[PDB]
Design a binder for these strands. Structure first.
Ligand SMILES: [Mg+2]
Ligand SMILES: [Mg+2]
Ligand SMILES: [Mg+2]
Ligand SMILES: [Mg+2]
Ligand SMILES: [Mg+2]
Ligand SMILES: [Mg+2]
Ligand SMILES: [Mg+2]
Ligand SMILES: [Mg+2]
Ligand SMILES: [Mg+2]
Ligand SMILES: [Mg+2]
Ligand SMILES: [Mg+2]
Ligand SMILES: [Mg+2]
Ligand SMILES: [Mg+2]
Ligand SMILES: [Mg+2]
Ligand SMILES: [Mg+2]
Ligand SMILES: [Mg+2]
Ligand SMILES: [Mg+2]
Ligand SMILES: [Mg+2]
Ligand SMILES: [Mg+2]
Ligand SMILES: [Mg+2]
Ligand SMILES: [Mg+2]
Ligand SMILES: [Mg+2]
Ligand SMILES: [Mg+2]
Ligand SMILES: [Mg+2]
Lengths: 52, 84, 136, 177
RNA sequence: GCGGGAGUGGCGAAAUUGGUAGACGCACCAGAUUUAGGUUCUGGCGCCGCAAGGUGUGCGAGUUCAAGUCUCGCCUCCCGCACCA
RNA sequence: UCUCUA
RNA sequence: UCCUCCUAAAGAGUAACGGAGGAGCACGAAGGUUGGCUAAUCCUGGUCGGACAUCAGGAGGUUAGUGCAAUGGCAUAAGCCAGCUUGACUGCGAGCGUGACGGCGCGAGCAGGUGCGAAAGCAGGUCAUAGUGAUCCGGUGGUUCUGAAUGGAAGGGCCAUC
RNA sequence: CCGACUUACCAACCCGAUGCAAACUGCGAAUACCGGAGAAUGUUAUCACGGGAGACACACGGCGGGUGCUAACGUCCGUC
């Protein structure tokens, strides 16, 4: 179970987040995906944050 | 004294039965969205008004009677919904 | 003692032994020893009857063995209760239906083949008979 | 295109004569020349592969295709996907011009050259030879190089049999023996 | 009878998650020391073999690109356990 | 400093 | 506990200290789409090069491949390369399957916004079936929903999540 | 160096002939099951909701089988 879990925080200022997993050993760089934000009803870049 | 007791069996396991098969047979009127066949592969294939699911499940996209038929050069078994 | 070299699986169900046989006609040689009864022949019974006809022909002529023991037979050891897995493979049998040609022979006279196959069938549990090569 | 013109004018008339073909399209012709360098020693360093492709690019003025392992074998200590060789396919005019420089310059520059083999035609006309040493081509500078490579030349032609290719190359005065 | 474990060169012993196998040491061989032997010092040393390479972890197949290490079966040795009436 | 035996 | 095959008696299902094997993950590409491609093995020839690297031709025709076990599938490829990308979207969901239940599954289509493609169209994770854990309690962010005189606040609720 | 030939230690592929398989299938039933139509028959025998239960230790016999020795008034399943 090396594949830890993270969250993809919206860059739209909202605290909306998708949750997902990654291998932090082999992929040290941050994951950035363009996902849908249901609050703004737009596709916005989400960035990796800690699952906390 | 004497009950030479012993043994075992590394072979106790099995999984649950997935209840596959053909849920609606031929000449059998269905509603749209009704599951016809649940299956692993495409042992059957989708014809007219019949969709193939994520798990190769054959469901009806429309209403009507189920038609089993063999087409193609490979003699594959197609399931179609006749109109009704 | 005949035995398969490899097997895909080590054990087998007990099964049944119903039906008629298939190896009915004398294919290769001239004379044959045909099974009339039903049962299973072990590898020991097969090799003992082979020895009895090889000695009865003084290694004259050619002997075919049409059957082959491919069924493993398990037994549980003594003072072992009926649970706790299937027993250990002890010996190998061939299921014999009526009509199965067991042995064939040529290069010898008919009367010599009769007395050799009689000495062999006296070592076999099932009841046999003597057959010859039929045209068609 | 000196040899392509010499083909089109004299070889076709020659082979139509010495084979009595119904059609002129039935004649053989060369199709491609493949230049492989199997470099199994690049597992030590990439630079051996990287410099052998530079040498083979001077021989034939193309950038070579670095070939890789089709599968993994343990006798050679390679895994499926390792860059393990280099090839060049030559077609057209660059094929003819290399084939000219080959049979005119490089084959005479072979040390103790005494002919080729006529037993190198793969049953179906396609000829294959292997050179021991890349310095026979004058593209390579002798002081500038360090390592004696070797490559192999494979002439793929449209000849059905083996002799029709043997006669075709003999029509190009190819030094068999 | 049940279970846990191990089987490597003449010998004791190593090896890791599969990427050659003998590191090491003892013995044995040879050299030089010595009047000689031992010690002590140096150098070699798994098997067939032409100097160049091949076969080689108990036995038999498998797995894997590739096994001493993975499977399975057979075997041998050790240990422990084999109880209530 | 050690230094056995024939 | 979960998955695959047999037993299992040609619908489903079906037991035993019955016969055999696996799972307690991985992947930010190993996903989506567009475009293209088609194996294993063997034969002959060929520098180092060898049973076995790479190269060319021929037989063969999927005996290969599928991230991993088995089964079923797979050429329109679900297999293999490259380009662009994030549909590994949010709210719903007719209608069916499966279970004693809790629950699990398939799903066209609808609204929004998006990606590839000229376009028709495809995409709501991976060829499918294992890769998992109820509730309570507690934590984090968001949200005036509530707020024990009133205004706030604490705390609670709801949404997401651990 | 090439190896000269002949052996008996065999033998790949291929071809012909011949068997076996629960975990083989280029074939393939009978029955069973699902659906539709139609009579006759049957005290709705069918389904839904609600009130009350009991029961969840089964046995033998037939057929199809696993296990066992195709041993057991044995054992475990399917069906009557
Ligand atoms: Mg007991
Ligand atoms: Mg090793
Ligand atoms: Mg006592
Ligand atoms: Mg003295
Ligand atoms: Mg069934
Ligand atoms: Mg049935
Ligand atoms: Mg049966
Ligand atoms: Mg495509
Ligand atoms: Mg080669
Ligand atoms: Mg894909
Ligand atoms: Mg898969
Ligand atoms: Mg509690
Ligand atoms: Mg308020
Ligand atoms: Mg208040
Ligand atoms: Mg069968
Ligand atoms: Mg009970
Ligand atoms: Mg009970
Ligand atoms: Mg009872
Ligand atoms: Mg019962
Ligand atoms: Mg009964
Ligand atoms: Mg029984
Ligand atoms: Mg009984
Ligand atoms: Mg009873
Ligand atoms: Mg029964």
């Amino acid at each position: 179970g090396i594949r830890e879990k993270i969250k993809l925080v919206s860059s739209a200022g909202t605290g909306h987040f998708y949750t997902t997993t990654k291998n932090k050993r082999t992929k040290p760089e941050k994951l950035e995906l363009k996902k849908f934000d249901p609050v703004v009803r737009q596709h916005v870049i989400y960035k990796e944050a800690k699952i906390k | 004294a004497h009950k030479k007791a012993g043994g075992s069996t590394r072979n106790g396991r099995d999984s649950e039965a997935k209840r596959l098969g053909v849920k609606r047979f031929g000449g059998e009127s269905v509603l749209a969205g009704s599951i016809i066949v649940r299956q692993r592969g495409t042992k059957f294939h989708a014809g007219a008004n019949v969709g193939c699911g994520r798990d190769h499940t054959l469901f009806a996209k429309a209403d009507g009677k189920v038609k089993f038929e063999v087409k193609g050069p490979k003699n594959r078994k197609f399931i179609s919904i006749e109109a009704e | 003692m005949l035995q398969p070299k490899r097997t895909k699986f080590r054990k087998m169900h007990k099964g049944r032994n119903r039906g008629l046989a298939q190896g009915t006609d004398v294919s290769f040689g001239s004379f044959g020893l045909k099974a009339v009864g039903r049962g299973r022949l072990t590898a020991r019974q097969i090799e003992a009857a082979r020895r009895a006809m090889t000695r009865a022909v003084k290694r004259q002529g050619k002997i075919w063995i049409r059957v082959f023991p491919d069924k493993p037979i398990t037994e549980k050891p003594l003072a072992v209760r009926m649970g706790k897995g299937k027993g250990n493979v002890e010996y190998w049998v061939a299921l014999i239906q009526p009509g199965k040609v067991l042995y064939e022979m040529d290069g010898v006279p008919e009367e010599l083949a009769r007395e050799a196959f009689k000495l062999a069938a006296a070592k076999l549990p099932i009841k046999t008979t003597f057959v010859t090569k039929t045209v068609m | 295109a000196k040899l392509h013109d010499y083909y089109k004018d004299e070889v076709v008339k020659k082979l139509m004569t010495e084979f009595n073909y119904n059609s002129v399209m039935q004649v053989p012709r060369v199709e491609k020349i493949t230049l492989n360098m199997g470099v199994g020693e690049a597992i030590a360093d990439k630079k051996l592969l990287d410099n052998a492709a530079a040498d083979l690019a001077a021989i034939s003025g193309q950038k070579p295709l670095i070939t890789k392992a089709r599968k993994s074998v343990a006798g050679f200590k390679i895994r499926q996907g390792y860059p393990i060789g280099c090839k060049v396919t030559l077609r057209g005019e660059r094929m003819w011009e290399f084939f000219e420089r080959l049979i005119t310059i490089a084959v005479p520059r072979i040390r103790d050259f005494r002919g080729l083999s006529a037993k190198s035609f793969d049953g179906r006309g396609n000829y294959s030879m292997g050179v021991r040493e890349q310095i026979i081509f004058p593209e390579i500078d002798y002081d500038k190089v360090d390592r004696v490579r070797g490559l192999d030349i494979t002439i793929t032609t449209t000849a059905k049999s083996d002799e029709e290719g043997r006669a075709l190359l003999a029509a190009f005065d190819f030094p068999f023996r």
